[PDB]
Amino acid sequence: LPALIDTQATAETRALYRNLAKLRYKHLLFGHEDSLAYGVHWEGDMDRSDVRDVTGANPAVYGWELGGLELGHTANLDAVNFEKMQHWIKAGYSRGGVITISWHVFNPVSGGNSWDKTPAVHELIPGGARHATLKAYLDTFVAFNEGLADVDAQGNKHYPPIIFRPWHEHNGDWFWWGKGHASEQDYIALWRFTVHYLRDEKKLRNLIYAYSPDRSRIDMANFEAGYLYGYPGDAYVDIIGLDNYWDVGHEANTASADEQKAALTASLKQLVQIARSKGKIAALTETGNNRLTIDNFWTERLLGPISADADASEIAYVMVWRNANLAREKSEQFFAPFPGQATADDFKRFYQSEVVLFEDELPPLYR
């Protein structure tokens, strides 16, 4: 009964959304960013994942990142080759996996990255002096998406559905499209234009749109109001997402473990209630414990709190961030384990949960 904002979405896109709406009550899809691109201790293999090396299974949800595409770069801001990315997207989809894409858009005013807070939203929205630049930027995704398509013998074009998750964590002040650097109304204009341009002007039919505030900058005593800062409206959102690294052991969080667990549960309960009220689907779109320093993280700090409340449990999926290559990037940053990593066995047991679905355990999501 949730319905997509694209009333003409492709059969497979409509099927995915319907199937997520059904599965969410008893299951949780596991996801990982850049899962096929590299791991902490490897890069180059065209069919490998840290997640699979540990569990024997690929993640159910594959996250990818477009930052730099808009500048005509051959690889994204983390040096992930766009052609390989298209290959990996098609591969994952072919196996029945789910595809989600975020976009750390470079600052069009300063030339800095997303974390350069130089204001720019006002320039990019309709009527702004750099509106043509926004169009140019979005066009690069249109072309990327075309690259994902297969054409059958009859000339019908087939695309992987994509959970497109733009302009994320906009309630934070760390991105140029964020609170403090863009007016709320201008942010809403940017979101609405993104939807109109992709869905209506360019006629992309394979997108599911995900909205994703950061939990750390939401007041738990006024959760809904915080969550809905810069919310563009029900006609522009399909997935009621949330990025929450805070309640899963962030080093700056002085709350006790028990208090954090309770907050994670409460955040997800409220997230679910919001999605239910709007006829949408909720998801924990980014989370994780950087460097996986927390014993039994998977069962105790993630699965446990998700499962501790009936409402909280109705999220459809959870994605953890990337496993940065140590040799290349020069320091440790990772959110899934790899063989030998402390939390690897707990992660296997997490996988073995009937609740948690990896790629190998998915029903047919696309019919």
Contact set with Na ion (CB under 5 A): 356
Nearer to Na ion, 152 or 354 (CB): 354
SS3 content of the chain, % helix, strand, coil (to 5): 40, 15, 50
Q: For the chain, after which residues does the C atom lie more than 2.5 Å from the next written residue's N, i.e. where is it broken?
A: none
Nearer to Na ion, 19 or 114 (CB): 19
Alpha carbon distance 246, 249 (integer Å): 6
The reply to whether 286 belongs to the active site is: yes
DSSP letter, residue 295? T
Burial of 264 (0-12, 13-18, 19+ CB in 10 A): buried
Which of the residues 286, 314, 329, 332 is marked catalytic? 286
Burial of 262 (0-12, 13-18, 19+ CB in 10 A): middle
Structure tokens given for 206:
């394979």
Is residue 80 within 8 Å of 65, Cβ to Cβ?
A: yes
Residue entry with tokens 């689907």 = 281
Task: State which residue has the least CB distance to Na ion.
Answer: 356
Minimum distance, C-beta of residue 354 to Na ion, in the bound complex (Å):
6
Nearer to Na ion, 195 or 356 (CB): 356
Nearer to Na ion, 169 or 359 (CB): 359
Minimum distance, C-beta of residue 232 to Na ion, in the bound complex (Å):
35
Minimum distance, C-beta of residue 360 to Na ion, in the bound complex (Å):
9
335: closest CA among 316, 322, 351? 322
The reply to whether 314 belongs to the active site is: no
Minimum distance, C-beta of residue 356 to Na ion, in the bound complex (Å):
5
Minimum distance, C-beta of residue 357 to Na ion, in the bound complex (Å):
6
Nearer to Na ion, 189 or 356 (CB): 356
How many other CB atoms are there within 10 angstroms of residue 21's CB atom? 18
Minimum distance, C-beta of residue 52 to Na ion, in the bound complex (Å):
14
Cα 327 to its chain centre, rounded Å, is: 26
Alpha carbon distance 13, 208 (integer Å): 7
Burial of 87 (0-12, 13-18, 19+ CB in 10 A): middle
Which of the residues 12, 33, 65, 169 is marked catalytic? 169
Nearer to Na ion, 200 or 345 (CB): 345
Minimum distance, C-beta of residue 78 to Na ion, in the bound complex (Å):
29
DSSP string, 328-359: HHSS---SS--TT-TTHHHHHHHHHSSSEE-G
Nearer to Na ion, 133 or 296 (CB): 296
CA distances 61 to 89, 99, 137, 171, 359, Å, are 11, 6, 25, 25, 8
Residue entry with tokens 């180059």 = 44
Q: What positions carry a catalytic annotation?
A: 169, 286
